[PDB]
Every structure is written in C-alpha cells, then in structure tokens.
C-alpha cells in the first residue's frame, strides 16, 4: 500500500523531529500528530509503531 508507506515515512520523520527536540510539549504534539496520521491510515501496525515511539521519546527526552 503506497498510502501506508507514505504514512510510515511521515511517521518516521515526525519521530526524528521529536527525538532532537528540547521541549517535551513539542514532542508530545508531534507524537499526537503522528498518532492521528496513523489512525487516518487504518493500519494497526502503524498504531503500534506510534505507541512504541511515544514510549521511547518520553523515556529519552522527559
């Protein structure tokens, strides 16, 4: 699915942007946007990836 791949690329880009951020609120907003994009893609795997990214970002940045 091309749409799924594009959504995955966008999710990874958002995760990369969040990883190099200093304000945890900005990272939370980016992760919320990524979760919304994953929900729009209708793929459980993308939701799982977003959930894991949230955990990793919250641990490392927070």
């Amino acid at each position: 699915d091309e749409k799924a791949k594009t959504a995955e690329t966008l999710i990874w880009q958002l995760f990369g942007k969040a990883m190099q951020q200093s304000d945890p609120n900005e990272a939370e907003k980016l992760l919320k946007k990524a979760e919304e994009l994953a929900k729009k893609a209708n793929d459980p795997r993308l939701e799982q990836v977003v959930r894991q990214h949230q955990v990793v970002v919250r641990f490392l940045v927070g």
Epitope: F15, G16, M19, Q20, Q48, Q52, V55
Partner: antibody
Framework: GQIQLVQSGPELKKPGETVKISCKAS????????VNWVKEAPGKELKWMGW????????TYVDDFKGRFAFSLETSASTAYLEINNLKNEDTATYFC????????????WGAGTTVTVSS | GDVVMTQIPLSLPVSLGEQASISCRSS???????????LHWYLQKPGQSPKLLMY???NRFYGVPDRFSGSGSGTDFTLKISRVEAEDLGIYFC?????????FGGGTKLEIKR
C-alpha cells in the same frame, strides 16, 4: 545491496597507547537505527559497552566503560568510530558493532568483529 | 543492579534427529510495563558473529527454520529444537532488553553424543 557492516583489521598495541576502530554501514537508511558496541573477552560473557544515537550523536556508556572510551560519528561517510586511550593488558578482546532497532529492541545485524591485543 | 541471566545446562550433548531443550532464568521479572516480555535468543557458530534466532519470547526471526520453538514466562524461559541437524551446533545464549542495560547469558554449547 546486501545489508552489512564492515570493520577494520586486527590491532596489536603496547600499553599506554591509543587505538581507533571503525565500523562502516551499507545497505539501509543509516539514520533510522542505533549503533551499539559489544565487547567479548576471552573465556567470559558478552558485555554491552554502550550505544550511540544517529539523530543527535549523544553517546551512552555503562559505568564500567566511562572515561577511557569514546564514541564518534561521521554521518556523511556513514561510519562510527570507537577510540580507546591508555591501554592496559585487560583490554585484549574482540569488539563488535551491531545495529539496534527502535520498535523491538534487538540486535539483528552484527559486524565481523575486530581483535585488539595489548602486550609488551 | 544488572539483571543476571543463568543458563542450564553449560554443555548439552545431543544426537542428530532428536529434540533438545535449553533453559534461561533471570534474576527478576522481565515483563516490561507496557506489557511485552523482551527475551531474545541468539546463536553463534565457531569463528563467526552471533545471529538472531528468536525475539520476544516465542516469535521467530525471518529465515529461521520452523523446527525452532520458544516458550516460557515470568522468569523462566525455554528453547526447544525438534530435530537437531549438523548445522545447528554452536553456542546459544539469551538476552533481555526490558531493563537498562541489556545483558547476555553465559551460553550453552551443543555437541554430538557418543
């Protein structure tokens, strides 16, 4: 191409010197994983040394491996460097650079390993 | 401190065409907060780098033959080979990633019995 990591050849050193080992990655997007280092001593267990994140370059070491060891990156050439200072006789071992994942947290791709031997 | 992994047995003599079992035991609970249990099994052959065999207790990595199986929970985990072959000899060890830092077991060596 085949996903792989390439490391330099064996090293023979004398105490008090400094060594530098390189690890070059090929076959994937270098900025979407983490680079972990593992040390294997003869007749002992594998020991996690630390990991470096490609996004910011900030390394993380275990307590035992602080001070004398250094991690560095060359993103343009897709290379990771491990630098060791003030060598001893206890540093004779084999070093692996491995790729670590962000979703399942395993080490799936391993390098061939570089042997470092220190003796006078 | 660091989680301690103990493997049983240290040397396992097995014969081609039979089943083998290896046990890994942690010092504490490996169940992560989010719900998944991160226990992985690696295999190393003489003169080569280790290769991943199993990830997250019982899943199978791509390319691994179907005869490998994993099971367990809590602090007891087990790997089972239904039909050993000549290419399955080596050193197997477990690892965890649920508590910083990851640690590796001592390793069990498989050899032919006579």
């Amino acid at each position: 191409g085949q996903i792989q990591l390439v490391q330099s050849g064996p090293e023979l050193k004398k105490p008090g010197e400094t060594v530098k080992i390189s690890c070059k990655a090929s076959g994937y997007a270098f900025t979407n994983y983490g680079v972990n280092w593992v040390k294997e001593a003869p007749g002992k267990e594998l020991k996690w040394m630390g990991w470096i994140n490609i996004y910011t370059g900030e390394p993380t070491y275990v307590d035992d491996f602080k001070g004398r060891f250094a991690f560095s990156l060359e993103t343009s050439a897709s290379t990771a460097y491990l630098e060791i200072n003030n060598l001893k006789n206890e540093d004779t071992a084999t070093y692996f650079c491995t790729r670590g994942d962000y979703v399942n947290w395993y080490f799936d791709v391993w390098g061939a390993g570089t042997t470092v031997t220190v003796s006078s | 401190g660091d989680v301690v992994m103990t493997q049983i047995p240290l040397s396992l003599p097995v014969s081609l065409g039979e089943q083998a079992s290896i046990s890994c035991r942690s010092s504490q609970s490996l169940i992560h907060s989010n719900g998944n249990t991160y226990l992985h099994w690696y295999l190393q052959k003489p003169g080569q780098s280790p290769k991943l065999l199993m990830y997250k207790v019982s899943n199978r990595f791509y390319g691994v033959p179907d005869r490998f199986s994993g099971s367990g929970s809590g602090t007891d985990f087990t790997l089972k080979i239904s039909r050993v072959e000549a290419e399955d000899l080596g050193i197997y060890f477990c690892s965890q990633s649920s508590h910083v830092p990851p640690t590796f077991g001592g390793g069990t060596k498989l050899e032919i019995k006579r």
